[PDB]
Amino acid sequence: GSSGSSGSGEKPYKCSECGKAFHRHTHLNEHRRIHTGYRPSGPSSG
Numbered sequence: 001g002s003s004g005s006s007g008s009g010e011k012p013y014k015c016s017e018c019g020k021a022f023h024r025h026t027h028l029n030e031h032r033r034i035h036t037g038y039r040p041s042g043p044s045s046g
């Protein structure tokens with residue numbers, strides 16, 4: 001089988017997009033920003 005899971009204790013918030021983790025939800029959210037494709041130009045021009 002596999003071996004590991006040594007040292008219990010993992011941040012409560014974890015990014016389920018790339019594989020990042022943070023202690024303060026705040027930070028995590030600020031990160032996702034990049035995951036939500038942050039582009040200047042939108043579907044329309046105005």
Ligand SMILES: [Zn+2]
Nearest residue numbers: 015017018020
């Ligand atoms: Zn991420």
